[PDB]
UniProtKB/TrEMBL annotation, chain B:
Belongs to the universal ribosomal protein uL3 family. Keywords: Coiled coil, Ribonucleoprotein, Ribosomal protein. The gene is B24N11.110. GO terms for cellular component: mitochondrial large ribosomal subunit. GO terms for molecular function: structural constituent of ribosome. Residues 267-297 form a coiled coil. This is Large ribosomal subunit protein uL3m. Residues 18-39, 175-200 are annotated as: Disordered. It comes from the Eukaryota. GO terms for biological process: translation.
Length: 183, 307, 46, 201, 98
RNA sequence: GUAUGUCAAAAGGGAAACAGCCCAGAACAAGAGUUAAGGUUCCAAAAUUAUUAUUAAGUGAAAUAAAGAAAGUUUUUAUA
RNA sequence: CAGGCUAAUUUGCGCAAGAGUGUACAAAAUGAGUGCGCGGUUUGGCACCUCGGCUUGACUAAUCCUCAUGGAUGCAGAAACUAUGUAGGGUACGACUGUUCGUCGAUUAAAAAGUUACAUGAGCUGGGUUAAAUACGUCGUGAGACAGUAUGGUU
RNA sequence: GUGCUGAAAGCAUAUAGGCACGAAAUUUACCUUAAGAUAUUUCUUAAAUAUACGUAAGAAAAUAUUACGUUAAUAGGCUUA
């Protein structure tokens, strides 16, 4: 029981993560060679990684009943990566229980009305547990079309360097070297 | 979803962070796209609030007999202007009639206090095409705002009819009268199909209910007469509502706007009948701050009986 | 134009082409013939 | 491509200017492919196109030639654009020096054509409008795109001129779209010696 | 028929792997019995018949591991997973030519 | 009818849901225990694990629609 | 009876091949006897289970009219034929019959079909079918009976 | 369905690539209802405001909705046309 005795404040705090839909991802890409062919994370592969963060399943203290999720700010949703002809041949459906009222729309037509942010929300939405926490977790997905967003000051930092910035890693390793000067 | 395709929360405000100047595509939705796909139909000028005063015929000097409705203008003023930078669309707010100060609430008494206009009876917005359709606040609109022969669209609330059956509301034919029919002469009959059709009554099924008392538009109605003294605008045809009800009159959307000379002549007549429209408005706005800050401090009585 | 399930060339000028293929549909196979317009054929329905 | 290997003879006066690999940023795409801006200036005008970067142009000026080459012949995308890029340069070179022309023959009783100005519908100042009487109740008028010169040596003969072949032929196809040649009397608009087999009856 | 027995016509890469390891595990049971008896200079008729007309997993073709013979099929082939108790039954040899 | 099994009288895991199919026979608990069928990006426990090829049609991905057509594409075997 | 499984059959369709007709010429039109299929509308099999009209819809598209369009020695024009898109709207009135169906009169741009418990009877109608009464013909020795006929018959 | 340019494939080709025409279907537009961000140099420190009561109505099964209540034409009466 000792493992759980302590300050659980920071384990349950909400962290503001960030990812760009245009930056190549060596991990979430199907192409790994040459490095110049590494693509960004596809629509569904990005949504599978985001749904894991919204659930907090990446934390060692995860529990499905507790809402221990985090925020995910996604930018550049206009250049969302897709393979094949999904952009023009995929269709989204809608029905309001009235026979004849079937609403269909393609991805390229849906990206013109509500941008690529709505295409990423429907993907993440379907990857979340179908329960009473689905709307809270999905609401923590901040998707934007360009590089601008109102959370440039919320993104997690380590020594003033936002995670994903050029020199955020060396800023983290420099803070852990000082933590070893103690019993 | 809750409305349409968007699953966005109803408290988020990301619009200002999606700008086309950043190289993004112009959305097909929003106030900018909506105003653009209605540019040709949106009128150029504003409308007027008129009262339906009855119906007659217009007799021509050669044999014409045209049924027409009489619409009277009762102290129609310009109360406010809706800009695209403050509200998201162009429109002019128009007033009608008067009202007792005691019957007007405090929120609206201070609303007119900052404009120099007496309390009105009814308010209504008339959308315009661009900023050229905005008029000075505190100018009266007369029947000469239109010209004889101009076609307009009249918008009013129809006559109420309470709970209506299926015959009056939806034009159902009813059933037989004497060939054995049993208690089902004016009934609606079958309400739908059986198990194969859904085991339910489908949405949108036409059924009895309340009728009337809703807005209705009649388009492309010429103006036969224009008299400023009486304050009437005789239009051809019928108009929705009862006598004494307020209606909205504006240029037809399915027609070409009036000539440029007319749109300018009318605008040029407001500067002559009311040469002091900004001086009286700024003066009324300046007094609002004095009285507003007097109410805050609690010294409002010092100004009422100041003289 | 005759919509068949088995389109075939009927002379030396008949050519097989796949037209109306774009980012939305796969298209159809055609039999274009500048000599005889009766050799026009199409494979598949819209 | 047996056409891409053939060198392109640059006649006297024509000057080819090869730009540098550039990538115009696009917010809707994660990776844009570089291109090369190739300018072909000469007496009649200047034409420009943006070719893929993998097409290599060894512009040797001492001999007034320019051969094309691709980085990989086994790729279907590179073989196709290799021949297409060559055919376009050949038209550009032969369009800025000599110029492309299209002749339209109007067959039929009552078919005429005139070239005059219509200042009411001018898209640009001084635009020429080809007026055609093709048996229609209304008059057919079309404005020549900016960069073309339309003339009428005879009432039943039009002569289009321009340095861009695609623009000239595309416009010649719009005028022919009003009266397509019929196979019973030959009435219609024929472009560049176009013909039609008639019926014996 | 209205009762749904959802049985796909082909096996997955996971069922094929376990099938290969089952065919390979039965080869070791016979090899262990055959070698243990050879040390004593003894043989069993069943072991002789198995090693004579039955191949090992490394000698079988992919179509013999994942399909069986069914005269009622248009190509006389049928998914081996459609056999009763296919997991715990030995089936390796089909008629010649099919 | 015959041979074999299950259900009937058998819960549990798998087959989306499932009397009869694939595994496996429930006396009660504990375990990141060891396995079967089955599976391992997310819903959802476990690989976005390795190797070599094919497909560009979302074909397909846990219920194979046919004959047939065709400068779709790959490979092999002849051949210029 | 309806639903379910099936699809021999059909007054439901498609594709493939092409004897033949088309003065000529297979594929404008036409298409013998056939083959490979779809579909679930007709008459059937099994036995898991023990009508028509009126009112008011919804849906399908294998299209009667209206819109765009290819082919047509056999597309001069007009009209029509065939085929490709397309189901937004319309598809009426009357006589006969209990009738859906069907026949006919006269108009019309046209007066096309199908599914939904062969939609809808705790919404109506009850003419058909339809228990007790009665007569007729036929069958039965008879009581009676009949996919018969006729008048009447608590919805 | 019909084109222009144009290669892969020296030709050809409205096939790749780059452009365009084109229907009572679709979308927009048009009309109504819902929606309720937002606006006012708007109001409120125990209120603003709303309801109740009374006279009613452009409203009407109840409810709701929209007015007026003496500094008042809301309904009735009276008078005149
Ligand atoms: K129900
Ligand atoms: K699929
Ligand atoms: K039985
Ligand atoms: K075509
Ligand atoms: K061509
Ligand atoms: K409206
Ligand atoms: Mg009333
Ligand atoms: Mg009646
Ligand atoms: Mg009665
Ligand atoms: Mg249900
Ligand atoms: Mg079933
Ligand atoms: Mg029993
Ligand atoms: Mg069991
Ligand atoms: Mg599964
Ligand atoms: Mg474990
Ligand atoms: Mg997991
Ligand atoms: Mg039974
Ligand atoms: Mg034709
Ligand atoms: Mg429409
Ligand atoms: Mg029925
Ligand atoms: Mg019922
Ligand atoms: Mg009687
Ligand atoms: Mg060419
Ligand atoms: Mg167009
Ligand atoms: Mg305020
Ligand atoms: Mg109070
Ligand atoms: Mg009441
Ligand atoms: Mg009175
Ligand atoms: Zn031919």
């Amino acid at each position: 029981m000792s493992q759980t005795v302590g300050a659980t404040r920071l384990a349950y705090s909400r962290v503001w993560h960030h990812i760009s839909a245009v930056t190549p991802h060596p991990t979430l890409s199907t192409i790994k060679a040459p490095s110049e062919a590494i693509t960004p994370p596809s629509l569904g592969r990005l949504a599978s990684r985001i749904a894991t963060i919204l659930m907090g399943k990446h934390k060692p203290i995860w529990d499905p009943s507790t809402d221990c999720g985090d925020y995910v700010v996604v930018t550049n949703c206009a250049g969302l990566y897709t393979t094949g002809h999904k952009k023009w041949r995929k269709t989204y459906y809608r029905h309001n229980t009235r026979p004849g009222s079937l609403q269909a729309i393609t991805m390229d037509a849906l990206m013109e009305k509500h941008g690529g942010a709505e295409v990423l929300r429907k993907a993440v939405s379907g990857m979340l547990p179908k329960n009473r926490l689905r709307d809270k977790r999905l609401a923590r997905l901040k998707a934007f079309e360009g590089d601008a967003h109102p959370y440039k000051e919320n993104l997690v930092r380590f020594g003033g360097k936002v995670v994903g910035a050029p020199g955020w890693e060396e800023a983290v390793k420099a803070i852990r070297e000082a933590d070893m000067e103690r019993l | 979803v809750k409305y349409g395709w968007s699953t966005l929360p109803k408290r988020s405000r990301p619009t200002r962070f999606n700008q086309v100047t950043q190289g993004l595509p112009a959305p097909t939705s929003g106030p900018a796209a909506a105003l653009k796909r209605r540019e040709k139909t949106t009128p150029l000028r504003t409308g007027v609030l008129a009262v339906k005063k009855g119906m007659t015929v217009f007799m021509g000097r050669t044999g014409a007999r045209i049924p027409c409705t009489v619409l009277q203008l009762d102290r129609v003023q310009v109360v406010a202007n809706k800009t695209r930078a403050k509200n998201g669309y162009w429109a002019v707010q128009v007033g009608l009639g008067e009202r007792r100060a005691e019957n007007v609430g405090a929120p609206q008494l201070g609303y007119y206090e900052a404009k120099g206009i007496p309390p009105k009876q009814t308010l209504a917005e008339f959308k315009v095409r661009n900023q050229d359709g905005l008029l000075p606040v505190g100018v009266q609109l007369f029947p000469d705002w239109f010209h004889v022969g101009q076609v307009v669209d009249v918008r009013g609330i129809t006559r109420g009819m309470g709970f209506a059956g299926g015959m009056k509301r939806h034009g159902f034919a009813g059933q037989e009268a004497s060939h054995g029919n049993s208690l089902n002469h004016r009934t609606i009959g079958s309400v739908g199909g059986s198990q194969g059709s859904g085991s339910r009554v489908l949405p949108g099924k036409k059924m009895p209910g309340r009728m009337g008392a809703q807005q209705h538009t009649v388009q492309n109605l010429p103006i036969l007469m224009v008299d400023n003294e009486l304050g009437i605008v005789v239009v051809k045809g019928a108009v929705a509502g009862h006598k004494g009800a307020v209606v909205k009159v504006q240029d037809a959307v399915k027609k070409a706007p009036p000539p440029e000379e007319f749109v300018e002549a009318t605008k040029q007549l407001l500067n002559e009948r009311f040469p002091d429209a900004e001086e009286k408005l700024q003066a009324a706005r300046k007094l609002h701050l004095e009285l507003k800050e007097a109410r805050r401090q609690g010294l409002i009585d010092s100004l009422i009986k100041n003289g | 134009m005759k919509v068949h399930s088995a389109i075939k060339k009927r002379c030396e000028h008949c050519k097989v082409v796949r037209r109306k293929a774009n980012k939305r549909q796969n298209g159809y196979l055609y039999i274009i013939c500048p000599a005889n317009p009766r050799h026009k054929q199409r494979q598949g329905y819209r | 491509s047996k056409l891409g290997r053939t060198p392109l003879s640059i006649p006297p006066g024509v000057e080819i200017t090869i730009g540098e690999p550039f990538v115009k940023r696009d917010m809707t795409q994660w990776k844009q492919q570089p291109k090369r801006k190739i300018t072909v200036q000469g007496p009649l005008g200047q034409l420009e196109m943006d070719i893929p970067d993998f097409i290599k142009i060894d512009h040797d000026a001492e001999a007034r030639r320019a051969t094309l080459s691709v980085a990989n012949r086994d790729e279907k995308e590179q073989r196709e654009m290799w021949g297409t890029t060559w055919a376009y340069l050949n038209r550009f070179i032969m369009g800025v020096s000599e110029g492309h022309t299209a002749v339209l023959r109007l067959v039929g009783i009552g078919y005429r054509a005139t070239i005059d100005t219509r200042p009411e519908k001018e898209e640009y100042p001084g635009q020429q409008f080809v007026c055609l009487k093709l048996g229609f109740s209304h008059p057919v008028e079309m404005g020549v795109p900016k960069g073309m010169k339309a003339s009428t040596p005879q009432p039943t003969r039009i002569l289009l001129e321009g340095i861009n072949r695609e623009q000239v032929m595309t416009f010649a196809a719009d005028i022919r779209r009003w009266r397509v040649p019929e196979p019973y009397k030959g009435k219609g608009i024929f472009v560049n010696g176009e013909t039609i087999k008639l019926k014996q009856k | 028929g209205g009762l749904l027995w959802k049985i796909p016509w082909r096996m997955s890469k996971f069922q094929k792997l376990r099938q290969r390891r089952r065919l390979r595990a039965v080869d070791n049971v016979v090899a262990t019995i055959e070698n243990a008896l050879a040390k004593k200079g003894e043989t069993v008729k069943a072991v002789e018949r198995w090693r004579a007309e039955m191949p090992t997993e490394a000698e079988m073709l992919p179509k013999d591991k994942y399909t069986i013979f069914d005269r009622k099929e248009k190509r006389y082939r049928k998914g081996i997973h459609k056999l009763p108790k296919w997991t715990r039954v030995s089936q390796r040899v089909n008629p010649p030519g099919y």
